[PDB]
Amino acid sequence: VHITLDPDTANPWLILSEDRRQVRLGDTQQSIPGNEERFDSYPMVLGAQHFHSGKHYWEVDVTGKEAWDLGVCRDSVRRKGHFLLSSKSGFWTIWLWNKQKYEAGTYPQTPLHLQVPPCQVGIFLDYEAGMVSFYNITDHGSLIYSFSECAFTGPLRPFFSPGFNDGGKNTAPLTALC
Ligand SMILES: CSc1ccccc1-c1ccc(C(=O)N(C)CC2(F)CCCCC2)c(S(C)(=O)=O)c1
């Protein structure tokens, strides 16, 4: 129930808090040991938990960030090199990036029109239903987007990115909310 970030998966540009509930962009590619699970080309990290069934929920503070990506991914997603975050490649995510532009990771991408920019985002997974939904905590829990008919067959993982290094313009953390 209590999501924790998995240091073995974390790109070396990421700083994880000791309690593994916060991740942020660092200023220098750290010199952490290597291992097959680590995202080597993007500032990405997984939650340690693996879901095979059930409903599951977590919540992330994004206050003060100009860019981030949140969602769920297959355990089997590739870790090394470059790739696109498509449902075919095993990703169900939403993101914030450019001039305050929110998008859902469909092909083609789906612009999301959020009158109230979220300070916290809820992520709700229902394995058996094939559903991942995103809630705008700041706008009283309004539905941002839902992926349906996901037809999961393998284990799933919480997926996070605090954005891209931009010169300290995006050092605010993602924080998992109790
Ligand atoms: C470090 S992740 C991050 C962190 C903060 C904000 C944004 C992102 C981020 C979102 C989507 C992509 C991506 O896959 N695309 C845009 C392609 C596509 F639209 C192609 C059509 C299917 C959906 C995905 C990428 S990426 C891997 O290209 O850098 C990065």
Side-chain angles (χ1 to χ4, degrees):
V1 223
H2 174 84
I3 303 305
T4 55
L5 300 171
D6 187 337
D8 292 337
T9 69
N11 178 261
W13 288 94
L14 298 183
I15 306 185
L16 278 63
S17 60
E18 181 214 295
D19 65 9
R20 296 179 185 175
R21 300 279 284 180
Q22 280 186 120
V23 62
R24 75 162 181 292
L25 295 163
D27 261 295
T28 77
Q29 202 171 237
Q30 294 176 335
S31 266
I32 66 187
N35 97 89
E36 74 281 5
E37 307 176 341
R38 198 178 314 279
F39 291 105
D40 85 336
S41 294
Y42 298 107
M44 280 174 188
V45 61
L46 302 186
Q49 296 62 45
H50 304 52
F51 303 123
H52 319 94
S53 65
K55 289 167 199 243
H56 306 270
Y57 174 77
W58 56 97
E59 193 167 283
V60 185
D61 189 286
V62 299
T63 304
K65 298 188 62 54
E66 68 176 2
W68 48 259
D69 180 289
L70 300 169
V72 169
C73 70
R74 301 190 179 114
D75 182 67
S76 64
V77 299
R78 221 209 317 141
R79 309 309 172 79
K80 308 306 196 216
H82 308 280
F83 49 84
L84 297 197
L85 297 186
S86 65
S87 303
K88 224 200 234 163
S89 54
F91 296 93
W92 299 273
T93 87
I94 70 166
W95 65 87
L96 168 66
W97 57 0
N98 292 321
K99 276 208 191 49
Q100 255 195 135
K101 296 287 100 213
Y102 297 91
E103 311 269 354
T106 55
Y107 175 70
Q109 48 192 269
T110 294
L112 297 174
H113 304 306
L114 307 191
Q115 286 156 312
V116 171
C119 293
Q120 297 93 30
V121 175
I123 304 94
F124 207 114
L125 169 62
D126 188 335
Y127 195 105
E128 277 86 356
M131 276 195 78
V132 187
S133 308
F134 297 83
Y135 296 92
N136 185 341
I137 298 312
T138 310
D139 192 35
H140 313 325
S142 63
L143 182 65
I144 297 169
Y145 191 82
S146 196
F147 292 93
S148 55
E149 304 127 5
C150 295
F152 307 126
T153 64
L156 302 181
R157 312 287 298 281
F159 177 84
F160 310 85
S161 169
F164 284 105
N165 358 69
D166 184 44
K169 198 143 65 73
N170 197 15
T171 50
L174 296 178
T175 303
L177 305 191
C178 26

